[PDB]
Amino acid sequence: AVGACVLCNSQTSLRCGACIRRPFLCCKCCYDHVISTSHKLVLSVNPYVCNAPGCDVTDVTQLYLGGMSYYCKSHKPPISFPLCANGQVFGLYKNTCVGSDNVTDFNAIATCDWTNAGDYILANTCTERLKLFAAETLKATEETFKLSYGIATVREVLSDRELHLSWEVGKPRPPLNRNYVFTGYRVTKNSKVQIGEYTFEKGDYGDAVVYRGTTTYKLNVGDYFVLTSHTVMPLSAPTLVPQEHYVRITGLYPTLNISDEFSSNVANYQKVGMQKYSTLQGPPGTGKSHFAIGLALYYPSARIVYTACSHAAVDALCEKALKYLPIDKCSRIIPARARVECFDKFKVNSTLEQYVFCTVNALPETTADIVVFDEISMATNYDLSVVNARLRAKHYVYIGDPAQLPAPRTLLTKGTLEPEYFNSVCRLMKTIGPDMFLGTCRRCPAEIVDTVSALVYDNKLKAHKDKSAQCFKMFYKGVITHDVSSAINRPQIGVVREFLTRNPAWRKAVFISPYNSQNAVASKILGLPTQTVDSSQGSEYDYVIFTQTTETAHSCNVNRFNVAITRAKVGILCIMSDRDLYDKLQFTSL
Amino acid sequence: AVGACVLCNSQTSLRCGACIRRPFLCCKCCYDHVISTSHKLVLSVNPYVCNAPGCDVTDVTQLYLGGMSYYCKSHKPPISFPLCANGQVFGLYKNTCVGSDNVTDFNAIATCDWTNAGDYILANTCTERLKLFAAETLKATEETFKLSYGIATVREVLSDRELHLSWEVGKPRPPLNRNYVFTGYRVTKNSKVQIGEYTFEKGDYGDAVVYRGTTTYKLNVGDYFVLTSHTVMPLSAPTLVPQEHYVRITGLYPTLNISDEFSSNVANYQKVGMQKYSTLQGPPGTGKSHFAIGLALYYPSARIVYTACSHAAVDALCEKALKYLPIDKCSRIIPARARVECFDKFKVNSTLEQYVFCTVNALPETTADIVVFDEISMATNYDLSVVNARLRAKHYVYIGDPAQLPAPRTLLTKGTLEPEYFNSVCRLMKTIGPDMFLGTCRRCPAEIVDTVSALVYDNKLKAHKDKSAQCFKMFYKGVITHDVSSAINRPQIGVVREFLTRNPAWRKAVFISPYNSQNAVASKILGLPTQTVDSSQGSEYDYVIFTQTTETAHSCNVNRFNVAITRAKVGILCIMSDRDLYDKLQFTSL
Amino acid sequence: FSSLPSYAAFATAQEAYEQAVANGDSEVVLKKLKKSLNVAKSEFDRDAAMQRKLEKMADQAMTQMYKQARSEDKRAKVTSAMQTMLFTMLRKLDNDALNNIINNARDGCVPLNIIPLTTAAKLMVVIPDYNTYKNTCDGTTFTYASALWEIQQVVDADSKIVQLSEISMDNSPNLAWPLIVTALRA
Amino acid sequence: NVIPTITQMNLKYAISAKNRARTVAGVSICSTMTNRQFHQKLLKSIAATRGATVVIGTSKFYGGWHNMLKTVYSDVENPHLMGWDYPKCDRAMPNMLRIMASLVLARKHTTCCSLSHRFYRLANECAQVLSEMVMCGGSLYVKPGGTSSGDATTAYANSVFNICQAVTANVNALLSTDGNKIADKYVRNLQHRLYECLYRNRDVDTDFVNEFYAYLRKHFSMMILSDDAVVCFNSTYASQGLVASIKNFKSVLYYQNNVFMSEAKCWTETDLTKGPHEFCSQHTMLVKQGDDYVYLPYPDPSRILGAGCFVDDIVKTDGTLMIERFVSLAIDAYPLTKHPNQEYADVFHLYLQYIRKLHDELTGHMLDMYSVMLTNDNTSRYWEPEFYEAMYTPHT
RNA sequence: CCCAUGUUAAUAGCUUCUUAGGAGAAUGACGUAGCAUGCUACG
RNA sequence: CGUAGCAUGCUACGUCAUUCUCCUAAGAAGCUACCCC
Ligand SMILES: Nc1ncnc2c1ncn2[C@@H]1O[C@H](COP(=O)(O)OP(=O)(O)O)[C@@H](O)[C@H]1O
Ligand SMILES: Nc1ncnc2c1ncn2[C@@H]1O[C@H](COP(=O)(O)OP(=O)(O)O)[C@@H](O)[C@H]1O
Ligand SMILES: [Mg+2]
Ligand SMILES: [Mg+2]
Ligand SMILES: [Zn+2]
Ligand SMILES: [Zn+2]
Ligand SMILES: [Zn+2]
Ligand SMILES: [Zn+2]
Ligand SMILES: [Zn+2]
Ligand SMILES: [Zn+2]
């Protein structure tokens, strides 16, 4: 197994095996990496270990090559050559390994444990190969941290669907939501076979778990569930394809007089036709997603793949397309698992259609015309590498806003991330400016956009709407539960259920609280359609009921509050907890 | 790598590496060549250099063979044998190298730089292998002189198609025409990739360049264009296949009573059937090309390849074939590039057809029946070797006139070439006489042919036409521009545009001026179909407007003027510059 | 070799001995310097032989490493090619009738010799002469394996398509024999 | 488990005396890679034991043919040499005898593997050799039976089959005698016990099997190379019928091999000073070497010329490249020197003179092409008969 | 002061050649132990 | 006469160079048996 160095792109056959992601390294780079960090295990075409059976010494600083094997100094053969020598480590293509001085960044990336903000800003200002490697090892660290969760052994079976569980003490219990899956095991002193894949939900009442299983086996007391981890695969494609301006529009055929509402976006459509890739930054609810729809209309002879990081974001993109684009060329690809509710109005799972909608992780390896990535802020460099590896295309559009909430980054806990380091595209947006820019809200009425222009957005919005007097505030605290470290506020849900009648137009309102456990709780007590803030950001609703649960660092972030409120098409009632956040916006008092 | 000596055809393995074309040489011939000229570098199966790393001595007069390598006298091993010794140079097949006394011609051919007329006449009176070698090294010298042109860095981009350039000072700027191509380079401190192949044209107004590119990349300021050179490949086939008379017609099946107009050409058709190859020399417009058409008709069971040096010459041959020959067996092969406008009426690029028309350089490697080469005067020995290497055939016809203008030979600048040294076939024509000869003009009216019989043609023409009173002369000077050393005469173009109405029958006339830049200028101001004199010579037009630009050595050559005027089927207006040339012909005064 | 300090000791022993010989030194000092020259020559020769064997061993092991890298790189290529062939042959499977007969089987085990016979969409009959062609697939439709087939193409030995009207008894010798006749299920 | 296995059928490209096309069955590596592992210890113990009945791996050079032909005459009474030839041996061999060969060749595994392991090895051999899918020019056919000529255990399985037919012919010849004409009172008792051990006895009788095998190696001494047999049968016993003559082999091949071995292709030599007529397609003659008489194998002296004049690859036409090929041909064709006929004897001198002329023209070309002769030229022994005569001497 | 152009199996035996390793032998150089002879100091 | 030191010569062991022989491994080229008469 030969390859290219991840630091200087020279031919080589060494792999620093102490790294979790196991990258290739040139000889000089491998020596400079194993001389500095605690990485003391190098894998050649066969591992550098003392091949004498009665020894365990693996460090490459002291291993000697003899005959056709490797030995320590104690089992050293009469004729032996030192591996770590004269500034290099012995390996293939030794004479053509051009060294590099960028070993400090590679050491810091492969050594740090992705906890402080320094590691992330190091993961976005480095070279392209270092960008890819940092994103891949970050994903691997996330997977290994997921692997360190507890084991759920049942105590008794309450019903055919309801189960009573107990998690093994000493390891933190994973939170209960639709993303996490488990594999069941039946221990009858033999035959430890996978009895099925189960997804868990917290019950309505009591310490109960509602399970949904692929299999229909009856659970017994001895069965225990273990969380499954996905093997993160390596990536190859660059984060951003190199920009190449074109003198004239290629691969596209414009259509005269597409519509009247898309009049002001014609020049930006031509600009997207011009450049190889382009970026569109705008404040929320300014037609950024609808710009992509008009872009699809303006070039009807283009096989367009809309892709997005989230799920309900791509579903809202599908809904907007059905509103404007002709239906019978659009498809919505869902994965094989598809444990979350998708949007079923287009011909589902039709790769061969012209207007194909997909999540980033579910993209099929295909050629395409102009591909539109939606909500770049929600995505990391792994997602950009995936979308640039699976979809080979002639035009790329990246639409999204740096001001919105980014990807979760569960590993990060200390320090806060600046917007410009969200990923490569957001860095492009905040370095040289967006290629296209449009700010004026066509979504929200005047008071909410005025407040959000008093918020994180330094006042720039000039929205075309008037005060609809449908924006309401509350202040009362409520009680916290801290179920699985996903808090639920029962009295706030009760007050929302109380309201619910005095203004009957809010019976079709949509519930917003990030707090996935409280989002599931809201589906029972009042039964409104509900959505978490993260799976939001791309859809909108006429009436929005937003509930701030706890005055924590999570549900008081200005980006999260802004992106929660700015989905209100005509009206929103927000019940607030923080005195400062509630006082910072101008709604009615209540 | 062994081979045959290019001087005596003995087996050998030496190559005089100082030559640009690197020919094989027998041992005795190699010694006689390196002892006389400055050629002091001989390549054996490995080069004769001092293999001691701390030395650079390459001359074969002092190199000594030792062990299995070669050394100078300073690094001479204790046992060593001198290479240059006793009249030979050490190499393979040393005992069977029969020497030759023709080393003077080979020295003069491989040493001279192809500037004076002595080199060319030495390149046509030598042996066959020396003929091939001289033509090949002449082509190589032309390519290397093409390589020494300047680099065009842009200054700004005027439009999507219009560009403003600047050539690097210190090297002459290549002229702007359709033949010369460039490769673009984008220097962004890295990634010097070929951004496309571009052909340049001088603009209508101002110092502007209109570019046509294979790629559609938008040009920026930093991009620069470098001229591309073609690697001239070696040839093997003889210039002329050995003549072998046949007692009776072989490989052909004559057809009785083909037509009435071809009556006088039947005996010449039988003579072409008789001989292996034959030559037809005649004054311009005497049916030489149409003789080949009647030859095709007379032997309808013969797969005939018409080939020609020029492009519009083979296109006019296609047009004449469509006039007479049945259409659905004729094809017109254009190259893959085909940057010049071809003739699109036959089934394009059909090698398998019976009547295949092609340029010399675009010929496919094929078997064929009788093959007709058109305008031999336009072609050099490289072209004859190519046509004799790619087309293996049973009968060869070479038609053309020594009196017309020859191949350009851009290297030649001092002295003038006699006609008989144009190539091998013209030497055959002017030594023993043409195999077939027909002189009587069926093209031009009486006054023009009378003038051309007062010109270079010592009076022999007896054309069958009468004075049509459609031949006109002018005298005024005009202004010179000297664009890229291809002059343009704007007031002469203006006077032609002025005329243009008083005799409306000349609105379909065709513009003739060699001067490719002025030929392109004529396409804008008056919009007549236009053709340079060199790409002429094989086509004809009813009304011809000929404009002599400058009283230089180029557009006052009697051959060029004759071949420009004698395309006039019914009439010609020539606006002249030289007092003597204008007075030497008898048209109307004006 | 020459980089080792033993070579330097050999050089300085040679220099001292040559200086003593040039200076005409005494026999005891000359013998001592001859002993120094001997022990330097011996030590340096031992070092040179050890270095040469070391270089031989290192370039033997790097040759082995090249060979093993080439082997492990060919294995991955063969694995990828094998998986490609298996998934393409999967893609060609007629998953309706085949799945029907398998789900119709006893334990899901059907003998392989009837997998084509009941599911193959294409039937290539190979016929050696006209006498058989009259009795096996006369006409544009014939019955084989209890299903009706329709002729789609008839090719000869050198793969030049022959129309069905040319296969006549008088026209039999002019044809290039055995005729691969490709038919489709109906 | 069981691994069904496609085997391709290719056409061999080699010199041959008749126009029928020869096909060789290439067996897929999934079957060779296990048949080698299962059988290699036995297939090396057979090919490294000298002086036995299955003479596979006894070199015919270095006085090895004389040792074969003296370990055939293992003290039989009135010898007559007999040779048979199975017509269509590798195609008409019944499936039952192939299973028999693959069992007797797998009886050695009494310790290394269990019973069901041996049975699945038998099923894998009978699915990858006996009744497999033959890929015959872009199409999978089913081979009804008969051993493929390309698996790991081909020549040895054919040897076991051949010994099975020889012993079956002996059993039939010993049973089918009139019984009251067998005067030798020990032999009549042997037949009366042979019938009982055949039909009236269900389990093995190792005393009688040992007695009968000693009888066979006393009066039917045999030599096998996979189907090429030589038998040294006692003449009086064959005439009385107590041992398998040719006619018994014709009958046994009729009802067990399903073919008819016509008596025009099975020879019988009534003498011994002339050796077997044709074994391993190399005739045998008795020469005087040194002081004593030894047998020498000489090939059909036309096959050597056919191998000289015709070459399967065009680069072998050049001659001067191939001296290391005419050396091998001369080694194979040397015993023609001592043949009493002369036109046979001239072939060896033709090859010697041709090697000498080839080397003369080789040094001519390597003196013209370069300028110096070869330094250490050691082709001065290939054109001397002493080297080839040393090749057939009993020393090494 | 410039104008033409790019097409084919398994097994077995044997011969030859190369490389690597091991073993042994021989010769020579060089070095450490043992034996003998001769010179010096001392007893 | 002995001890210590030095010189010369003769044996035992170690390192290097050269040559020869034998074997074991690996590799390359070729032929024959095979196939049919
Ligand atoms: N020119 C316009 N005319 C009418 N409506 C518009 C126009 N531009 C934007 N809108 C409305 O504004 C909304 C913006 O939607 P979207 O692009 O999804 O916002 P975001 O990009 O913030 O998610 C669309 O639903 C669209 O109906
Ligand atoms: N016998 C003839 N009858 C009628 N027209 C003729 C005859 N001979 C020649 N021509 C005319 O003379 C012209 C000569 O054309 P061509 O051979 O192309 O001249 P050139 O060889 O000088 O280029 C032809 O176009 C043809 O029409
Ligand atoms: Mg949006
Ligand atoms: Mg002409
Ligand atoms: Zn590392
Ligand atoms: Zn590196
Ligand atoms: Zn060790
Ligand atoms: Zn030269
Ligand atoms: Zn010569
Ligand atoms: Zn030198």
mmCIF file with all atom_site columns, N, CA and C in Angstrom, chain A residues 243-248 250 274, chain B residues 159-160 186 211 216-219:
data_model
loop_
_atom_site.group_PDB
_atom_site.id
_atom_site.type_symbol
_atom_site.label_atom_id
_atom_site.label_alt_id
_atom_site.label_comp_id
_atom_site.label_asym_id
_atom_site.label_entity_id
_atom_site.label_seq_id
_atom_site.pdbx_PDB_ins_code
_atom_site.Cartn_x
_atom_site.Cartn_y
_atom_site.Cartn_z
_atom_site.occupancy
_atom_site.B_iso_or_equiv
_atom_site.pdbx_formal_charge
_atom_site.auth_seq_id
_atom_site.auth_comp_id
_atom_site.auth_asym_id
_atom_site.auth_atom_id
_atom_site.pdbx_PDB_model_num
ATOM 1  N N  . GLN A 1 243 ? -11.889 27.832 -8.273  1.00 0.00 ? 243 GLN A N  1
ATOM 2  C CA . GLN A 1 243 ? -12.731 28.733 -9.042  1.00 0.00 ? 243 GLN A CA 1
ATOM 3  C C  . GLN A 1 243 ? -12.103 29.023 -10.394 1.00 0.00 ? 243 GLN A C  1
ATOM 4  N N  . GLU A 1 244 ? -12.929 29.013 -11.435 1.00 0.00 ? 244 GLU A N  1
ATOM 5  C CA . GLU A 1 244 ? -12.473 29.335 -12.785 1.00 0.00 ? 244 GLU A CA 1
ATOM 6  C C  . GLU A 1 244 ? -13.564 30.155 -13.464 1.00 0.00 ? 244 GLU A C  1
ATOM 7  N N  . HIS A 1 245 ? -13.345 31.463 -13.551 1.00 0.00 ? 245 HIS A N  1
ATOM 8  C CA . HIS A 1 245 ? -14.309 32.341 -14.193 1.00 0.00 ? 245 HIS A CA 1
ATOM 9  C C  . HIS A 1 245 ? -14.431 32.002 -15.671 1.00 0.00 ? 245 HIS A C  1
ATOM 10 N N  . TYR A 1 246 ? -15.640 32.144 -16.197 1.00 0.00 ? 246 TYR A N  1
ATOM 11 C CA . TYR A 1 246 ? -15.908 31.904 -17.603 1.00 0.00 ? 246 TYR A CA 1
ATOM 12 C C  . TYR A 1 246 ? -16.274 33.217 -18.281 1.00 0.00 ? 246 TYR A C  1
ATOM 13 N N  . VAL A 1 247 ? -15.847 33.366 -19.536 1.00 0.00 ? 247 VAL A N  1
ATOM 14 C CA . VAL A 1 247 ? -16.168 34.582 -20.278 1.00 0.00 ? 247 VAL A CA 1
ATOM 15 C C  . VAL A 1 247 ? -17.655 34.637 -20.593 1.00 0.00 ? 247 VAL A C  1
ATOM 16 N N  . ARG A 1 248 ? -18.255 33.490 -20.893 1.00 0.00 ? 248 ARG A N  1
ATOM 17 C CA . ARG A 1 248 ? -19.665 33.422 -21.235 1.00 0.00 ? 248 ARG A CA 1
ATOM 18 C C  . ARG A 1 248 ? -20.284 32.214 -20.551 1.00 0.00 ? 248 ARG A C  1
ATOM 19 N N  . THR A 1 250 ? -21.699 28.815 -19.829 1.00 0.00 ? 250 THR A N  1
ATOM 20 C CA . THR A 1 250 ? -21.470 27.492 -20.388 1.00 0.00 ? 250 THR A CA 1
ATOM 21 C C  . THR A 1 250 ? -22.268 26.467 -19.600 1.00 0.00 ? 250 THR A C  1
ATOM 22 N N  . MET A 1 274 ? -21.943 32.251 -14.774 1.00 0.00 ? 274 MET A N  1
ATOM 23 C CA . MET A 1 274 ? -20.586 32.643 -15.135 1.00 0.00 ? 274 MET A CA 1
ATOM 24 C C  . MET A 1 274 ? -19.550 31.819 -14.377 1.00 0.00 ? 274 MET A C  1
ATOM 25 N N  . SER B 1 159 ? -13.357 42.650 -24.134 1.00 0.00 ? 159 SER B N  1
ATOM 26 C CA . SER B 1 159 ? -14.694 42.084 -24.221 1.00 0.00 ? 159 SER B CA 1
ATOM 27 C C  . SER B 1 159 ? -14.599 40.581 -24.003 1.00 0.00 ? 159 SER B C  1
ATOM 28 N N  . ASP B 1 160 ? -15.733 39.895 -24.154 1.00 0.00 ? 160 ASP B N  1
ATOM 29 C CA . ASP B 1 160 ? -15.733 38.438 -24.069 1.00 0.00 ? 160 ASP B CA 1
ATOM 30 C C  . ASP B 1 160 ? -14.917 37.798 -25.184 1.00 0.00 ? 160 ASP B C  1
ATOM 31 N N  . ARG B 1 186 ? -1.758  30.336 -16.928 1.00 0.00 ? 186 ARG B N  1
ATOM 32 C CA . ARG B 1 186 ? -2.291  31.123 -15.823 1.00 0.00 ? 186 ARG B CA 1
ATOM 33 C C  . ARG B 1 186 ? -1.334  30.972 -14.648 1.00 0.00 ? 186 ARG B C  1
ATOM 34 N N  . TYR B 1 211 ? -9.560  36.667 -30.169 1.00 0.00 ? 211 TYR B N  1
ATOM 35 C CA . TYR B 1 211 ? -9.098  35.317 -29.900 1.00 0.00 ? 211 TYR B CA 1
ATOM 36 C C  . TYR B 1 211 ? -10.242 34.322 -30.003 1.00 0.00 ? 211 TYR B C  1
ATOM 37 N N  . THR B 1 216 ? -13.303 27.804 -22.723 1.00 0.00 ? 216 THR B N  1
ATOM 38 C CA . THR B 1 216 ? -14.156 28.965 -22.492 1.00 0.00 ? 216 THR B CA 1
ATOM 39 C C  . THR B 1 216 ? -13.796 29.687 -21.198 1.00 0.00 ? 216 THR B C  1
ATOM 40 N N  . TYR B 1 217 ? -12.565 29.523 -20.724 1.00 0.00 ? 217 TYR B N  1
ATOM 41 C CA . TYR B 1 217 ? -12.126 30.188 -19.505 1.00 0.00 ? 217 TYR B CA 1
ATOM 42 C C  . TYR B 1 217 ? -12.039 31.694 -19.713 1.00 0.00 ? 217 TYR B C  1
ATOM 43 N N  . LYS B 1 218 ? -12.477 32.451 -18.712 1.00 0.00 ? 218 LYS B N  1
ATOM 44 C CA . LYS B 1 218 ? -12.366 33.900 -18.782 1.00 0.00 ? 218 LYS B CA 1
ATOM 45 C C  . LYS B 1 218 ? -10.917 34.317 -18.584 1.00 0.00 ? 218 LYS B C  1
ATOM 46 N N  . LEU B 1 219 ? -10.423 35.166 -19.478 1.00 0.00 ? 219 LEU B N  1
ATOM 47 C CA . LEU B 1 219 ? -9.040  35.607 -19.409 1.00 0.00 ? 219 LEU B CA 1
ATOM 48 C C  . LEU B 1 219 ? -8.871  36.672 -18.338 1.00 0.00 ? 219 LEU B C  1
#
